[PDB]
Curated annotation (Swiss-Prot), chains A, B:
Induction: Circadian-regulated with a peak in the late period of the light phase. The record marks 196 as: Positions MEP for the nucleophilic attack. This is 2-C-methyl-D-erythritol 4-phosphate cytidylyltransferase, chloroplastic. The chain holds residues 76 to 299 of 302 of the full protein. Enzyme of the plastid non-mevalonate pathway for isoprenoid biosynthesis that catalyzes the formation of 4-diphosphocytidyl-2-C-methyl-D-erythritol from CTP and 2-C-methyl-D-erythritol 4-phosphate (MEP). Is essential for chloroplast development and required for pigments and gibberellins biosynthesis. Divalent metal cations. Mg(2+), Ni(2+) and Mn(2+) are the most effective. Co(2+) and Ca(2+) are only minimally effective. It is found in: Plastid, Chloroplast stroma.
Length: 211, 211
């Protein structure tokens, strides 16, 4: 368990400071303090490499870097190439979610270890309906909003990339490389506080949360 | 079309002022100015009756009142009893959504007239997954977040209430009286700005929208 997890940190709105510190550094430090986390392979444009470099000697993890790709999955694959040969879990996180709780990361790590694949989620508070191509409600289910981390064993993630490669399967917002696997995905119940940061509305909320 | 629609306005966070005016009055006035709207049957506790009474002579609609019930559907039925005998559409709206645009109300009214039942919605921006009782993703759809107005012909709404009455069918968050009808429900594409107001986060966003 200890030093068993590689974080792929996916990292402009993620470098806007929140209560003075850049957004991307909040999750970076949350992961670094966890004894389970062994390395953080950070995915960022070389302009921002220094932003993480500054804190390298203080943190109790291996810092490494990767170049981003066009779409989210390209950046994950890039990060996956630098992880440890003996890492037991990869922990993929969106740097735009600075407020993830250590306790919720612990939960999804534990669930990922047990199941093979787990993602942090919350019950969708809004009333959500399926709508067909004619704009009609498909009438009838517990729907969940998916956050990050996404925690997965590296052999599973690799098999996902290889299946989509070999058969040339299409990949979208809601249908990733791992959606094509028969291997189950567990949904670990997180916190509504683990919001993503895009709008300036999010900062005015996120400061309220941090306090 | 003109003077053809009865609004049931469902109406504490809906009486917190936004840029100085109570939240419930924003939608109230939006509906009152529309030539299609004939009456606003307002659903509120008698303490707040005066809040709408003040503006009665200025508005170009019939103001009426109804007592709320325990759950949302009880308040709708209460409001439904005061509507016009010759009203062609009932337009059910949550007063906690003060920012609905006239143009979007026009759209859902037109769709409700054509289809019999229509609701304002937006594509769900979050990644939403179905999760089973064992907390596993049900792998595979266009999902939409439902707002208000909900626009429906009164005979349809009545038939919904009577079917649930007669058979004693169960009613929840996601399965209303109208979900049990075979009659189609159209989803009119609205605006992401049409947010519901509960948290103080919403006010700090809603003021940004209004400007
Ligand atoms: O789509 C997933 C689900 Br569902 C669960 C878990 Br765990 C991980 C993923 C996931 C997607 C990707 C990306 F490469 F496409 F970005 N990497 O991992
Ligand atoms: O559930 C609906 C859908 Br789906 C569409 C439309 Br249009 C209207 C409704 C609806 C629900 C109710 C309530 F009485 F339960 F509150 N009244 O109308
Ligand atoms: K190092
Ligand atoms: K190692
Ligand atoms: K009147
Ligand atoms: K009348």
């Amino acid at each position: 368990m200890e030093k068993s997890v590689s974080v792929i940190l996916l990292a402009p709105k993620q470098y806007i400071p929140l209560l003075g510190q850049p957004i991307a550094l909040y999750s970076f430090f949350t992961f670094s303090r966890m004894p389970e986390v062994k390395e953080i392979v950070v995915v960022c444009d070389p302009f921002f490499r220094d932003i993480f470099e500054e804190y390298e000697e203080s943190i109790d993890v291996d810092l490494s870097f990767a170049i981003p790709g066009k779409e989210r999955q390209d950046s994950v694959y890039s990060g996956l190439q630098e992880i440890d040969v003996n890492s037991e879990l990869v922990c993929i996180h969106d740097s735009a979610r600075p407020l993830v709780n250590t306790e919720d990361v612990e939960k999804v790590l534990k669930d990922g270890s047990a199941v093979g694949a787990a993602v942090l989620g919350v019950p969708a508070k809004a009333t959500i309906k399926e709508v067909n191509s004619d704009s009609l409600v498909v009438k009838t289910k517990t729907l969940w909003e998916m956050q990050t981390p996404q925690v997965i064993k590296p052999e599973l993630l690799k098999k996902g990339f290889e299946l989509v490669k070999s058969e040339g399967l299409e990949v979208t917002d809601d249908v990733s490389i791992v959606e094509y696997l028969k291997h189950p995905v567990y949904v670990s119940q997180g916190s509504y506080t683990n919001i993503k940061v895009t709008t300036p509305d999010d900062l005015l909320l996120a400061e309220r949360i941090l306090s």
